[PDB]
Amino acid sequence: MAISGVTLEESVRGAIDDLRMKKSRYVMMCIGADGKKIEVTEVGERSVNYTDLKEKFSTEKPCYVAFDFEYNDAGSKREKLILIQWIPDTARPREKMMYSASRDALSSVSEGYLPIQANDESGLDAEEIIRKVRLHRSVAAALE
Template sequence: MVDLRIRQTASSGVTVHPDCLSEYQNLKTKRSVRYVIYKVSDDKTQIVVDQAASTDYDEFIKALPERDCRYGVYDFEYEKPGEGKRNKICFIFWSPDEAPIRSKMVYASSKDAIRRSLEGIGAEVQATDFSEVSYEAVLEKASRHTR
């Protein structure tokens, strides 16, 4: 078994805690949660699970802090005209304008480590304000990616 703490180290030195992948699998394969939000630990050494829930997209957005960064994955359900309902796992890099610059730097330099460890992402969104993670904005990104 590969040790994720070694394999998924960011240029910032931040590692991905194994629970991050476990919770992602709960979303991806077990479908026991609808979203997972990840954060950098207080000591800035690991990316850890902040929260996971099976509530709707509005609740996911409300869970994002106004003044700090986060990573999130959401099992986004939408309807494509003529093709029916679809699901796409969306990765969201949340870096609000109001977040401290140090936080933005740590999250930006650590993003690839978490992103590489989460296989099966269908769309990616980078957002600096809530309008960029509105349902409509994410729907536009999710529906144009066909992977």
């Protein structure tokens, strides 16, 4: 970590682009070791659901998870893209600090995403996510 002038590049933007219309379902994103730029590391389509992302839980993996979260609202299934940032107390300092801080910049390219942090599997757990998305609905109901 030297050049912390974290830049957002095209593959990142493209990943957001494909997820925005659900060509994909999740985009796990990472930042270079230098903190130089945010980059996509792994991407998956609609086959990857809540159960799958939880079995993919590795508390020491560099992460941001842009995921299309479908949930219940008023009896209707709504779709809200959520932007997860793993800030794990078990991860490497860079992953904890840089990923939490640089989420701000990613929020500009991530249209429609609600910033949600995961420290533990529980923050990546759909059931808690539903609950916090329920809370976010006060603003999430609008495009902001």
